[PDB]
């Protein structure tokens, strides 16, 4: 039971490294759902095929179902749901995932 | 050139998730340098063995040799000392290393 959020001699350093902060709040990722946030992020405005989502945040060469993108972007969506930030990771349906 | 930070409808995202927070400012660290900070954070004022860091930060079963711990202490410290807090990991010549 390791302790959420440590400070010692000035320094604050949280358990979970991939924590986003949104209206004075935080909200706890995993490594993967926080890579597929900046990666779309970063994309804002163009949207992404799953397969180069794919090969971003699971790796070029992944043996990993391709619908794991599809898989995550709900747990993503879940996610930014408490904070009402969910609509902005918008399906194209037949191509991908865009935020806009 | 992946951007730095990025905002995106309220929610703020950095590249690398694995900084701390320092004087206002923050350190930016690799995934081993932070959960090395963070398992002595974590054991302050208890003096850690080197291998007990080797099986928590690396792994029980690790092929790595021990020194790494050095190296990487090492690492750390010299993250630390811009903001004069580098003296805080302190060696136990024998044993291992402690943050008091």
């Given amino acids: 039971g390791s302790k959420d959020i440590i400070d010692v001699n000035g ?3 949280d358990k979970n490294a991939f ?3 949104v209206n ?4 706890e990722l995993t490594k993967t759902e926080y890579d597929l946030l900046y990666l779309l992020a970063e994309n ?7 397969e180069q989502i794919l090969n971003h945040v699971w790796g070029y060469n ?5 619908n794991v993108v599809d898989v995550y972007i709900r747990y993503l969506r879940n996610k930014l749901k408490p904070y009402d930030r969910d ?7 037949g191509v991908g995932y865009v935020i806009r």
Avoid: L
Avoid at 44 to 50: A, D, G, Y
Avoid at 87 to 93: A, L, P, Y
């Fill in 11 to 13: 320094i604050t350093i």
């Fill in 19 to 21: 924590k986003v902060t």
């Fill in 24 to 27: 004075g709040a935080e909200i």
């Fill in 44 to 50: 804002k405005n163009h949207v992404m095929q799953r």
């Fill in 62 to 66: 992944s043996e990993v179902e391709t």
């Fill in 87 to 93: 609509k902005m990771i918008e399906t194209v349906r």
